[PDB]
């Protein structure tokens, strides 16, 4: 938790969507649709993973076409934020007949 209490959001996630949960927790409660976003992230993770928006609305009892905003808020939570640190890979291509 202390490591997760460090940059970036979701450090040592292990379990998936821990970056999303950490970003949502870091996000202030003043943001709207945050409760439904957290509900989708915590336990409707499969519901959104299956893109089961109708099933998400039916199970989470979230408002129709309004839970979409919560799902978007959950989506904007830096998934694989740790992959952001890795940005440089060496270039390697062998032209064995180089038409130019």
């Amino acid at each position: 938790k202390r490591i997760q209490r460090f940059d970036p959001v979701g450090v040592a996630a292990k379990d998936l969507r821990d970056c999303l949960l950490i970003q949502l927790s870091q996000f202030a409660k003043e943001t709207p649709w945050l409760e439904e976003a957290r509900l989708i992230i915590s336990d409707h993770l499969d519901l959104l993973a299956n893109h089961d928006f109708r099933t998400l609305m039916r199970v989470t009892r979230l408002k129709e076409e309004v839970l979409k905003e919560a799902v978007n808020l959950i989506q904007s939570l830096d998934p694989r934020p740790g992959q952001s640190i890795q940005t440089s890979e060496p270039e390697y291509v062998i032209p064995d007949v180089l038409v130019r």
Partner: protein
Amino acid sequence: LGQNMRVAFMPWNGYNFEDSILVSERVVQEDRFTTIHIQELACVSRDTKL
């Protein structure tokens, strides 16, 4: 090549110790002798193996 600025000959208050020039706020105001520059940069596309 350059600005024709008014000056007067006298030392004063140590601010002109050996080889100093005392430009007051005036030449700041009309900002004569403001410098111009244009500098460039670029990037490449480089269709890669990855």
